A paper describes a structure:
[name] (GAPDH) is a highly conserved enzyme involved in the ubiquitous process of glycolysis and presents a loop (residues 208–215 of [name] GAPDH) in two alternative conformations (I and II). In the presence of inorganic phosphate (Pi), GAPDH catalyzes the conversion of D-glyceraldehyde-3-phosphate (G3P) to 1,3-diphosphoglycerate (BPG), accompanying the reduction of NAD+ to NADH. All the structures reported in this paper have four subunits: O, P, Q, and R. Each subunit contained two domains: the C-terminal catalytic domain and the N-terminal NAD+-binding domain. Two anion recognition sites, “Ps” and “Pi”, bind the C3 phosphate of G3P and inorganic phosphate, respectively.
The enzymatic activity of wild-type EcGAPDH1 was 3.84 × 104 times higher than that of C150S and 8.13 × 103 times higher than that of [name]. Superimposing the backbone atoms from the structures of C150S.NAD, C150A.NAD, [name].NAD, and C150AH177A.NAD on WT.NAD, it was found that the RMSDs were 0.134 (1266), 0.182 (1135 atoms), 0.135 (1247 atoms), and 0.122 Å (1219 atoms), respectively. This indicated that mutants have a very similar structure to the wild type.
Author numbering:
A (entry chain Q): 1 to 333
B (entry chain R), D (entry chain P): 0 to 333
C (entry chain O): -4 to 333
């Protein structure tokens, strides 16, 4: 089975390898590109503030990591076209740096000798997969594909089930979400976004997201029907997405919950809970999204009805399990 | 006409009531406090505040009093309000902040013990419930026990009133992303019967019920039964935000919504406006009960259908207290 | 052939420590069986707290409940709700050893109520005055079959004692002072407000560095008699959920180098399931879930020397919740077999 | 005297330098700022502060300036100090707050770029290093590049000075339990070659090195080489504490230590005293470089051996900044 390279050995990139080893994937990770020394990547891989000690041995040499006894070449090329993917035969690149989020930009990996790129972020108008929502749209001719955001992977399965069961006419979402590396530790410049410049562990911070606006790449029938944003708050990982919808039918809360429960049955990407969990309970989830029946709310006056549905997601590990499900299929094609 | 206040419950709100009266140089004087602890400990907590920093006035204590800015305040430790000797120092209006007398029936005890009026710092069932600069005109001279609802009501009501007056609210649901409070838990452990309240508040996003929207009708009677909502409690110490998703009575643009809110906030001591990219710590110490944030307005339109999201910040401690004090100063003149 | 050791346990106080006691006993597949729990709350709430843990994540076994029990990994555990230990009906399911985790019975006088209630022995998860007090793999050889009520001291004691023991054995400790930079606990406050008579305990624990008294150093003589009255110290409670670190500054009986100290400490951690060693640049979250009572950190060793005066700073990490619990369980397993 | 200042690095320290200068109505004139960003973003950050709240003065900007309390401040964006055009507005003293010029050879660049003096907001090697009200009398009219050491030095030095003057410090070791800073990481990820600095600062106790004790001899020459120490960085946003364990030259009691420190803080604008049970958030906004805490003094004695533990609080941002400004004011006049 296919050989993989990881560009960007960050929060997502390191967890990609963790999850591939955890599921004993036949994918062989043969090369990693980042901006730093093997010694430092080894330290970051062995010790994780969110998920604890790495479950396999980690060592490094001057130019590689040794993970569970197996060598992974380490490169440090800030420009992707300079990465020597052919040296170890990396055919599929998991693109996790944040800096190649377009077909034009990730073309650099194919120029550098790879066959396919899976981008761990929204990447404009390209094929965009939420596993177990629209992964059947992948085919053998795709070369550059996106798995959208963590938030998309949370929102899409819930929106899909509601639309399939009842029709979504229009809706808006807010995700209350763990802070990430795009934000700031102390108040200081963070590119052009003013709110991103503010101390992330000390604030509720409004944040734009494209999860709702671009949902049509994943669920074409919902194109233009959703908007949304984020409130970034001081938890280290673990997030929750609220969606307020007008549906195509009057419903009860039990009816909505029953429809979602059916959508999560035999569904390794989309979980269900009716337990009164909190964000730390989603840390380490193996789902991309967990619908929370306890938070469903129907507000009605006359023939006007608003439906609020809520799903949790581990924006790090849970999303990564979706990235890996997509990678395994992308690599078989 | 009334000028002497007693505080029952010298907690987060109780202590800030005193701070704010002194800050605005009120003619109302706090003459007595009832709590569950010693003056030494109340002095410590009044002097040193994790959220608002050092108390701006001198504080000392004796065995049975606090001395604040050179003025003596009697301190009692009566667990049952009927036993508080309000008459000794002449406390006329009781600011009821314990959480344990949130009904006209329960707070009657303060009148039984010799006070003239009670202002409850929380929802208290179906009594007159005031958001200052929304419905404080409903107060008259015959009222003896009233509520100022919750911090969340004081955040939701001014925004909902402005939208309803301008456009009509047909139906809506709110979510407040809110600072954790003392009803929650420091470590995972029992907290009465409330499962989510049992979880470590500074390490979790925790869904939480609120009556702010369900009981809005007490403040805006035309919206009775038209709103629902809840909270997501998160790890900030104070400073919160309320999102409201509404179906309005006409099609609107974001600019139209924001300009209506700007007009409702103009020369409005209770209801502020920002179009700056603020975050929750910027609201700490706010002197408003609510601050509408025009940067977060969102209109989602599909044909005849339309969802309007409006967002307002609130300092659930100090900002709310400024509203409690506005209501108190008026309540005391009627 | 083999006469059965005591095997049935009751837990008083199904709190942070009590719930982890059960987790660790199942983890190590102990032959001890928790047959009963006493707390102040319903089975429903205990089952919710056992299943969902903010510090260690989902419980690794099934959890259900009835009106009067928990069902854990298919096994029934009776649940009682007696706030006075003397009233707990320990004899109904035959609880022999009580793991006393409420914080309300920290003396022999108080904890003997469990014996009146039908138990045979009590192990207290906290300092409990001058009773027999065990840090496993430091002084557990002082336990014998006539010990009926025993203490495992505090988390901080189980961190401090193995480091002090190694230093004292190797070099002599003449005098020393400890500061533990420690995760906040349930004795503190979520928001500023009264917390008994302790002023600092009244302040918001997740928003402050908070000085805090501890007896780990002052009572060390119960565990290392030669250091009785030679140590003092305190804690700085800080905003992490679990995971702590203890610094000891000592005058030793000999001049030393940092490498000599680190080597002595490494030797003391060898073949020692209670006491670990690291020379990696770890931080507190790396100790969460530790199976040691204490992990010596060679990277933080510091020798300050002016002439014949010398100060030695030695530092050990500890998971004040799970790491401490592993020590409590090691002591319980031995206690049951004496 | 010189009156015109430039700030290099408009960060946490750089912005608070400006805030404090205005707070104390200094006659110093900040005429220029160099950073890496646009006036728009610098204006936003000056106006809204997560640790100290809203800026007390008006703030606007243009494409190349800030307008603060009505006064124009030029904004440059030169990443190499030698290219900063300090002569355009005649900046004479540079307050060097980037962390990238912490040596005489590095900060020489500001002088080549037209400035007359540099005050570095950090340790900067073997140069004149001032803790105000410990050794500011060593500042000399010919000095042109000076350091104010670290926040931790400004905490440790006044305590060590008082102990050494009264009793003699023979040897000692320090641990500061300290708020996290921008040298650390928000999420786990590379942070130069510094492994512990690479770990999520608001979720960890993180040991780290500090020169505060090792270099104390620059400030208190008799203690050169007599102190060592380090830091534990923990999740509070600002507000820190320093513990010192010492062998003294004299047998002492706690009261004796505390009284000696009390006397050293009397009439001392840089060095405060408390015997209240304060916690870190109570030091936020302090106007001292250091506040000695008598409640934490500990004497451990066995026979003729004695260890003395003394503890001082410090606001590593604003408190240190008040010391930087004191030094700057004196520096400007020499
Ligand atoms: N919650 C999350 O963190 C999350 C969830 C879903 C998707 N994503 C997306 O995944 C991607 C990475 O997110 P992350 O949290 O892992 O960020 P991160 O900052 O933790 O990791 C980025 C890694 O890429 C390295 N890097 C940066 N530029 C590079 C370059 N030119 N070449 C090679 N390496 C480079 C960095 O050293 C770092 O190690 C982003 O696109 C992000 O939007 C993040
Ligand atoms: N914290 C907020 O953000 C907020 C906002 C709006 C309204 N409120 C409401 O104000 C009231 C107080 O809230 P808080 O955050 O200050 O809680 P708190 O726990 O900080 O204060 C409660 C105080 O009352 C004392 N107390 C409890 N029972 C008492 C009794 N029988 N007699 C005398 N004293 C007693 C307690 O010792 C404590 O000092 C509550 O009803 C709350 O719902 C809180
Ligand atoms: N948390 C730590 O880091 C730590 C470490 C070592 C030792 N300890 C000690 O372990 C003991 C428990 O600590 P914890 O952190 O689990 O406290 P906790 O507050 O989390 O648990 C106490 C439990 O006991 C229950 N309880 C209280 N009184 C009771 C009573 N009279 N009868 C029955 N149940 C009662 C409570 O409902 C709660 O569930 C304490 O003595 C503590 O000093 C704590
Ligand atoms: N934060 C504290 O507690 C504290 C206390 C005492 C001393 N210090 C020291 O003060 C200095 C700054 O500390 P800080 O906390 O403000 O750091 P910071 O990261 O908050 O601010 C540094 C500023 O310098 C800018 N900058 C970086 N490189 C630059 C360059 N080449 N040219 C122009 N601008 C540049 C950055 O954009 C930023 O605005 C450091 O030397 C630090 O050691 C910090
Ligand atoms: Cl949108
Ligand atoms: Cl509701
Ligand atoms: Cl002690
Ligand atoms: Cl040193």
């Amino acid at each position: 089975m296919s050989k993989v390279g990881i560009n960007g050995f960050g929060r997502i990139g390191r967890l990609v390898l963790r999850r591939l080893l955890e599921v004993k994937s036949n994918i062989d990770v043969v090369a990693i590109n980042d901006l730093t020394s093997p010694k430092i990547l080894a330290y970051l891989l062995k010790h994780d503030s969110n998920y604890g000690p790495f479950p396999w041995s980690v060592d490094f040499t001057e130019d590689s990591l040794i993970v569970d006894g197996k060598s992974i070449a380490v490169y440090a090329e800030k420009e992707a076209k300079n990465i020597p993917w052919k040296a170890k035969g990396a055919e599929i690149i998991v693109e996790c740096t944040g800096f190649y989020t377009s077909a034009e930009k990730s073309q650099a990996h194919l120029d550098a000798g790879a066959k396919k790129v899976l981008i761990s972020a929204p990447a404009g108008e390209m094929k965009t997969i939420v596993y177990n929502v629209n992964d059947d749209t992948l085919d053998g001719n795709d070369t550059i594909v996106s798995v959208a955001s963590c938030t998309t992977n949370c929102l899409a399965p819930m929106a899909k089930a509601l639309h399939d069961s009842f029709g979504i006419e229009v809706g808006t979402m807010t995700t209350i979400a763990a802070y990430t590396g795009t934000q700031s530790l102390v108040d200081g410049p963070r590119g052009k976004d003013l709110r991103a410049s503010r101390a992330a562990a000390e604030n509720i911070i409004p944040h734009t997201t494209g999860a709702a606006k671009a949902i049509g790449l994943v669920i074409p029938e919902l194109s233009g029907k959703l908007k949304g944003h984020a409130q970034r708050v001081p938890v280290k990982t673990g997030s929750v997405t609220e969606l307020v919808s007008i549906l195509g039918k009057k419903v009860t809360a039990e009816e909505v919950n029953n429809a979602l429960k059916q959508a999560t049955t035999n569904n390794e990407s989309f979980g269900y809970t009716d337990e009164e969990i909190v964000s730390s309970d989603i840390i380490g989830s193996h789902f991309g999204s967990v619908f929370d029946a306890t938070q469903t709310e129907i507000t009605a006056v006359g023939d006007l009805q608003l439906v609020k549905t809520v799903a949790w997601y581990d924006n790090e590990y849970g999303f990564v399990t979706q990235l890996i499900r997509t990678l395994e299929k992308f690599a078989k094609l």
